[PDB]
Design a protein around this nucleic acid. Structure first.
Ligand SMILES: [Zn+2]
Lengths: 131, 60, 157, 97, 102, 206, 84
RNA sequence: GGAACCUUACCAGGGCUUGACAUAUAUAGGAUAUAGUUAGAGAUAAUUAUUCCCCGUUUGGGGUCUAUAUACAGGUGCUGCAUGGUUGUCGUCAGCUCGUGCUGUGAGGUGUUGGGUUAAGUCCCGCAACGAGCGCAACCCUUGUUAUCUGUUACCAGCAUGUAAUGGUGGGGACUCAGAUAAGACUGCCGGUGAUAAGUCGGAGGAAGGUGAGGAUGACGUCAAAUCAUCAUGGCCCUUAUGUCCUGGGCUACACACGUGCUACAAUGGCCUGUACAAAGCGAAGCGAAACAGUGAUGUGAAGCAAAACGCAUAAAGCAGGUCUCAGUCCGGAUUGAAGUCUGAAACUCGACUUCAUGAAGUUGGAAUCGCUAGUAAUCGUAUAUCAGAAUGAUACGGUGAA
């Protein structure tokens, strides 16, 4: 019970949940006991994920651990982004205004709809073809 | 439905492939539901009246 | 009818290679089938190929100018007054400018003859850069078709 | 396109069938080049006939006509005449310039 | 860990009487003076049925129902013969049902 | 075919099922169907004697003990002769099921604060060629004066035996069907007649 | 296309009728309903009328008929070669 | 929300006539019973084993079926224009009416005709109108934040640690999570505008702002709209028949015309190899693992499990490499031939799947026409219902994700 992780946070996305742990270090990232770069194979999604750190100019001095499950690759990237934002907030009040300016505190409550009877999908309907 | 068909469904066939489930309330041969052992129309009527415990309307 | 649509998303100014919204929008227009990663890779590779076919370091510059060489100015919108349909000219808005440009390049590149993915699209991109090809032809066609029918310009309602 | 004559609960005398055809050649001088389909449904339900004619136009207009009668010949005469007149009216709608 | 535990699962259609029976049991066992592990809520089981509305052709129009089952769990430490006997002896309002494992 | 069943709307919000028990997957269908059998047999055996019962509701605390509660406003007549009719139920029920049936009679306090009772009364009246408009007006007035905050009655069918079917409706007070927190009582009844069948529906807001 | 582990299908009544015909020198015709019975190689060279729902259609069975089913040679619906 | 038999209402055939099934009236000794025989396609009849049994200590009795004679049964036969019930539709469109009063000889009108305003007959003011009811909205259920309560079968941070693969093991309430109880969003507040209004455009706080998103909820009535074929039902109709038991055929038939979907025509792709990330569901005659055999469909086996405990089930697009070169092609996989897999008594007409070969039409499709405003179109898989077996349909779930 060292509690070396100085702060902890949670983040959510479409159907994914990630738990974030701030530790002292050179900024290394550990995700699901695997390398961050090897796990999130898309550099686009990795930049997606590390954007909160670059905005809060804190990368390279805090190490991150992530336990993430659910959702797809993009969903997990968004979830860990939200988790990083919440962890930085839990750390310092100073970053609150800039994070809220970038919208990193309000999470995408947007989720997939449900299918409806009489519809091929959430909104698509069957063909009419009146003639 | 046809009471004779209801009784024959109740009875034992020569083998199970010869027998089909029926709503034994109304004997409708089809639209059956195993969890309730009755057809869609009987299920709808009685669940709507609340005679089937645990079954309420679904908001999704 | 109930105008003043809700504020667009606009938040996707792609934070991957250039922090530029216009590249993101171009990739989105590129998309088939719901495959953002494929579109992003194709676009990145193709613009790189263009930047080394013209051998400049700054790829933003050449990409943006090849877009602006196709962004149109005045287009034709059809109205009708008194049972007479008139193809009145009207000035486009800037967003519609990028839209029409990107649509024209994409259509020409897809319908061209080529070997491969970024091959087709880089080839079309430099043709636009040099102000020649199907995309530029379509742009100038729209331009001077609108100009050939400038008499009705007083119908801008 | 050429017209589709359907029937329910009734049997087509060839007399009445070519009666229907003879009433329908009125279209193929003026209207045929403007329509997608022309369906004519006959039903015999309450010791009477119920006729439903239906036409689709190339510009998105849909014409429907429902009638009842006692004698098939008279019902067909009235219903086809009404259908032709309404079709002419729509054609003139559009061509009024 | 523990010498043995009594695993008792409470099943119901109705949350109110399910909960009522839950505190009834917890009071009944704390009367017998045994250490207790918290009433722990299991996920509710939802079975959705979609049925036609009209008794005939109309297909686009339907109606949906659920069956909802609510489940709670109680764990009893250091099983006692008298404690198990009392648990079996307890009477219970209809609509809430009990499953016991030693 | 509009107008969803109000009871179905109000179940689990402010109403409850007409059968109090719960069982797992193994026993559910069999016990459900034995409940249905209980109702149909009781109602056959009683509407042989033409009796109008508000409800038949079941309580099953035990997989082999069952409590059947008939709720009605003429409890003595329903009882019959010294509970001999009560046991006439019970013996017949055990003649087909293997459980212990205890029958109790729930007395109705306010006969016109019960939509089902109102509906049965209407149906019996129109079964004896009573004029539908007069019957509906009288029943509406009586139950509205007794203290109900809103009442609506609709009968349909061959009224007065004409060839052409018709429906007649009366109402006054508040009958807010779309309100969920409303306490709306709904009753349905049905009259067999020499000219056909006549449906009677009653909504009553409290 | 049954499994091998099941072997071919012949109805039992038809099968002992086939054995009786095999033990009889008289080559009598056998009338049958079980169209699903496989032509077992033993019952080559017989004459069987199978019911196609209307009438008993007869066949002489040769060796090469083996492996088929009896219904394969009793047409059940007739087309007059024209749709008028 | 499943036509190989049953289903099944049709057809060619064979039996039964208080009937395949009931209730009640009086006989006179078992029911059908379990397993077979005789013929049979089976239904069937003759049969063989055997009985009036149980409560009473048996006769008399209490009821029970034979097997008879009836009251009676029966019908998916006609009429939805004799009907109930249920449903579609205009239409989740915002309308539809009543009490009293006033007004017109009257049918009626006013209220509900005015100016603003809203998604709305929503709201404000004025007006011979004053009020009210069914609707709108709200109350409800999911999802979106936080607080308390509980940490197994769930969770795993800091510990040890099982070589794995598994929080797997000892451990731990921190977190997620599950589900109960509550808070929270009400134009609440601020600025401008608006008739001091109703309202309206931005701003702050905040997870959520102007109905947050979705669902449920469908007024008076219309179309003699759909259904007697789910049930109920008036009248008519058959009564060894239109009823009923079984065998087989049929609902799967074709020179044709139209509607709904799937797969494609290929390079935002096909094929080969390696690797990564889900949710919602289902399991008792049912889930069926580890492994082995097999190119494969699957086979033997049984662990575990009435299951947030185990199983279905290592999701697919994706990514990392090799190959193809615009070719009717390594595109397309229809069609047929051969050999297999599973289901059940049986799958020839008329099941699904696999292996091998066969490789057609098809070059983005005329007139015309459909769906969709954001997690939406588009595409990729998963699960369920009916079910012995058999979905491109239907219901539901998640992944990527626009213009
Ligand atoms: Zn039924």
């Amino acid at each position: 019970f060292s509690n070396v992780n100085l702060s902890m946070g949670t983040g959510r996305r479409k159907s994914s949940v990630a738990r974030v742990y701030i530790r002292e270090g050179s900024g290394n990232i550990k995700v699901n006991n695997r390398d961050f770069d090897s796990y999130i194979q898309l550099e686009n999604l990795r930049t997606m994920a590390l954007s909160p750190l670059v905005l809060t100019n804190t990368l390279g001095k805090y190490d991150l651990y992530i336990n993430v499950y659910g959702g797809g690759i993009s969903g997990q990237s968004g979830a860990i982004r939200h988790g990083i934002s919440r962890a930085l907030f839990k750390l310092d009040e100073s970053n609150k205004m800039i994070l809220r300016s970038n919208g990193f505190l309000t999470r995408d409550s947007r989720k997939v709809e449900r299918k409806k009877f009489g519809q091929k999908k959430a909104r698509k309907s069957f063909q009419f073809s009146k003639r | 439905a046809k009471k004779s068909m209801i009784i024959r469904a109740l009875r034992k066939p020569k083998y199970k492939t010869r027998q089909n489930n029926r709503c034994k309330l109304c004997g409708r041969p089809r639209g059956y539901l195993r969890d309730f052992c009755m057809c869609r129309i009987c299920f709808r009527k009685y669940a709507s009246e609340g005679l089937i415990p645990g079954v309420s309307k679904s908001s999704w | 009818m109930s105008r003043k649509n809700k504020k667009i998303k606009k938040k996707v100014f792609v934070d991957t290679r250039y922090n530029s919204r216009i590249v993101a929008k171009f990739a989105n227009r590129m998309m088939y089938d719901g495959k953002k990663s494929i579109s992003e890779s194709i676009l990145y590779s193709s613009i790189d190929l263009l930047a080394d076919k013209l051998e400049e370091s700054d790829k933003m510059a050449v990409f943006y100018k090849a877009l602006d060489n196709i962004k149109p100015l005045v287009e034709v919108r059809s109205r009708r007054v008194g049972g007479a349909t008139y193809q009145v000219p009207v000035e486009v808005r800037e967003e519609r400018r990028e839209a029409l440009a990107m649509k024209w390049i994409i259509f020409a590149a897809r319908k061209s003859s080529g070997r491969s993915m970024k091959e087709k699209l880089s080839n079309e991109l430099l043709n636009a850069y040099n102000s020649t090809g199907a995309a530029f032809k379509k742009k100038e066609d729209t331009h001077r078709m609108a100009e050939a029918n400038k008499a009705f310009t007083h119908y801008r309602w | 396109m050429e017209p589709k004559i359907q029937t329910v609960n009734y049997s087509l005398n060839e007399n009445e069938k070519n009666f229907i055809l003879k009433k329908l050649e009125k279209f193929d001088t003026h209207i045929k080049k403007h329509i997608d389909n022309l369906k004519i449904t006959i039903k015999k339900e309450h010791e009477l006939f119920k006729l439903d004619a239906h036409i689709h136009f190339n510009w998105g207009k849909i014409i429907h006509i429902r009638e009842d009668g006692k004698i098939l010949l008279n019902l067909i005469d009235s219903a086809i005449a009404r259908l032709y007149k309404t079709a002419t009216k729509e054609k003139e709608k559009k061509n009024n310039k | 860990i523990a010498k043995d535990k009594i695993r008792v699962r409470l099943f119901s259609f109705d949350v109110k009487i399910l909960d009522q029976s839950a505190e009834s049991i917890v009071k009944a066992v704390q009367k017998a003076k045994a250490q207790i592990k918290g009433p722990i809520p299991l996920p509710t089981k939802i079975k959705k049925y979609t049925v036609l509305r009209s008794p005939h052709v109309n297909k686009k129009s339907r109606e949906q129902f659920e069956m909802r089952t609510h489940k709670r769990l109680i764990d009893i430490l250091e099983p006692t013969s008298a404690l198990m006997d009392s648990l079996m002896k307890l009477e219970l309002p209809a609509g809430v049902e009990v499953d016991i494992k030693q | 075919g509009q107008k969803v069943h109000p009871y179905s709307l109000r179940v689990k919000i402010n109403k409850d099922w007409k059968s109090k028990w719960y069982f797992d997957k193994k026993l559910y269908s069999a016990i459900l169907h034995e409940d249905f059998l209980i109702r149909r047999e009781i109602m056959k055996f009683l509407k042989g004697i033409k009796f109008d019962i508000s409800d038949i509701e079941i309580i099953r605390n035990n997989p082999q003990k069952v409590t059947v509660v008939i709720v009605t406003p003429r409890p003595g007549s329903v009882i019959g002769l010294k509970g001999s009719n009560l046991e006439k139920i019970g013996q017949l029920l055990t003649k087909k099921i293997s459980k212990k049936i205890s029958i109790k009679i729930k007395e109705v306090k306010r006969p016109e604060l019960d939509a089902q009772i109102i509906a049965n009364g209407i149906a019996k009246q129109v079964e004896n060629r009573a004029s539908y408009r007069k019957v509906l007006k009288s029943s509406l007035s009586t139950s509205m004066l007794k203290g109900a905050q809103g009442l609506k009655i609709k009968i349909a069918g061959r009224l007065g035996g004409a060839e052409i079917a018709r429906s007649f409706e009366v109402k006054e007070g508040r009958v807010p069907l779309h309100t969920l927190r409303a306490n709306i009582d709904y009753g349905f009844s049905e009259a067999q007649t020499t000219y056909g069948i006549i449906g009677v529906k009653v909504w009553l807001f409290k | 296309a049954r499994s091998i582990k099941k072997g071919p299908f012949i109805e039992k009544s038809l099968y002992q009728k086939v054995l009786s015909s095999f033990g009889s020198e008289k080559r009598v015709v056998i009338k049958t309903y079980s169209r699903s019975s496989t032509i077992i190689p033993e019952m080559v060279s017989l004459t069987i009328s199978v019911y196609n729902g209307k009438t008993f259609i007869p066949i002489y069975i040769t060796e090469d008929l083996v492996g088929h089913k009896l219904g394969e040679f009793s047409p059940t619906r007739i087309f007059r070669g024209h749709a008028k």
